[PDB]
């Protein structure tokens, strides 16, 4: 029924990461577990798999990752694992757990020698239709999540792809178009979350 994926994040080049794929409403052992990767703005690449218990937990691994992967299953925890060693910058991608015999939301793996940095959150103050937003500046690595009014404001929201600045730090803007008549009365709060640095910010955006 549900898939929890973790163990990703920032790792220095030459480092190791152990991805976890926890199943909820079913037994993983009866299913084949695959891992598929996707580098930002690129296609799909199969990484490896582990066949169901009946099929002797048989493992196969992508040649591009040869001798660097170890796929397992902890049946007592109902969880699959992808151990990846000697990671290079080319391994930076979204890694998805794929149940065969559903696709998870994935976990981002960033192979960089840069340090984690929490963002600065600045309001994009308004002034028929008005626009307002939040500028989420100087953070590393990706991702950052942005919601408006704890998820109660979704219409007209545009959260932009982050841009990597010359400093090697990311920056993104999140905006909402709202009725200008609502400006003095309705409260607008952007909810920022940068999990890598444990930076959570609730910023009220006011007209002046």
């Amino acid at each position: 029924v549900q898939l929890v994926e973790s163990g990703g994040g920032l790792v220095q080049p030459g480092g190791s990461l152990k991805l976890s794929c926890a199943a909820s409403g079913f037994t993983l052992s009866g299913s084949n577990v695959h891992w598929v990767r996707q580098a930002s703005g690129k296609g799909l690449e199969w990484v490896g798999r582990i066949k169901r218990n009946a099929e002797s937990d048989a493992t196969a691994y992508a040649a591009s990752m040869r001798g660097r992967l170890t796929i397992s299953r902890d049946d007592s925890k109902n969880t699959a694992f992808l151990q990846m060693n000697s990671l290079k910058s080319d391994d930076t991608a979204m890694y998805y757990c794929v149940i065969r015999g559903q696709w998870g939301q994935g976990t981002l793996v960033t192979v960089s020698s840069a340090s984690t940095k929490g963002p600065s959150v600045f309001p994009l103050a308004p002034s028929g239709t008005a626009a307002l937003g939040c500028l989420v500046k100087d953070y590393f690595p990706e991702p950052v999540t942005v919601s408006w009014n704890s998820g109660a404001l979704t219409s007209g929201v545009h959260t932009f792809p982050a841009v990597l600045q010359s400093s090697g730090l990311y920056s993104l803007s999140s905006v909402v178009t709202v009725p200008s008549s609502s400006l003095g009365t309705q409260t607008y709060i952007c909810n920022v979350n940068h999990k890598p640095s444990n930076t959570k910010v609730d910023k009220r955006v006011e007209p002046k």
């Binding site: 199969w46 937003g133 500028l135 792809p161 920056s171 993104l172 905006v175 178009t177």
Partner: protein, 219 residues
């Protein structure tokens, strides 16, 4: 490895009209049962890929009959009978005959819609950012079509070159438009030295370029 070839790599279809995506396999995917070891996926913006077709022609649960997978052996076709706005994204074919599982390059489906001019908004740096020692000027181009748009920054009529970065959202699943954010970075001392901050926008939906500006400190 089995090589998966997709044709075309991108297309623009208006809602109500059909779309066809071809997939070529390097080796036959035909099974003994008459089916094929070929699947179709859709990846919508910000989402993981979702299954459309399995076994060459079998629809995944909750996929409407608008979508069909056809073909056998090495040649496959994904057809969308009538394209909806929600269909915007990247389509991939995938063989599951053997490991390594292989995918086609991906086909980006653009939903063609009427020309829509952007609504333009300029934002000065916040007081809190200036307090922190930096200055970012943001320019918003909201809900436009087609994707081609040009933004030109001017500071006291000086053309800004190389001190701005931009990012565009992917096609909207409901209204089929794009949005763009452009950020002008300057030092706090350069920001304080100048008065007029203008963002000039060029787009097909605009008969003339639109300028949105502000004067630092209201005047």
């Amino acid at each position: 490895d089995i090589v998966m070839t997709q044709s075309p790599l991108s297309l623009s279809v208006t809602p109500g009209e059909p779309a066809s995506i071809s997939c070529r396999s390097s080796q036959s995917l035909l099974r003994r049962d008459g089916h094929n070891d070929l699947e179709w996926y859709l990846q919508k913006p910000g989402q993981s890929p979702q299954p459309l077709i399995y076994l060459g022609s079998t629809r995944a649960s909750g996929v409407p009959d608008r979508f069909s997978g056809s073909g056998s052996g090495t040649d496959f076709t994904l057809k969308i009978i009538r394209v909806e706005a929600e269909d915007a994204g990247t389509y991939y074919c995938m063989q599951n005959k053997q490991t390594p599982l292989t995918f086609g390059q991906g086909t980006r489906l653009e939903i063609k819609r009427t020309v829509a001019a952007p609504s333009v908004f300029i934002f000065p740096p916040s007081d809190e950012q200036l307090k922190s020692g930096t200055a970012s000027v943001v320019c918003l181009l909201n809900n436009f079509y087609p994707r081609e748009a040009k933004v030109q920054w001017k500071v006291d009529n000086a053309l800004q070159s190389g001190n701005s970065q931009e990012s565009v959202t992917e096609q909207d699943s409901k209204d089929s438009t794009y949005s763009l954010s452009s950020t002008l970075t300057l030092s706090k001392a350069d920001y304080e030295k100048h008065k007029v901050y203008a963002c000039e926008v060029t787009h097909q939906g605009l008969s003339s370029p639109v300028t949105k500006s502000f004067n630092r400190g209201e005047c």
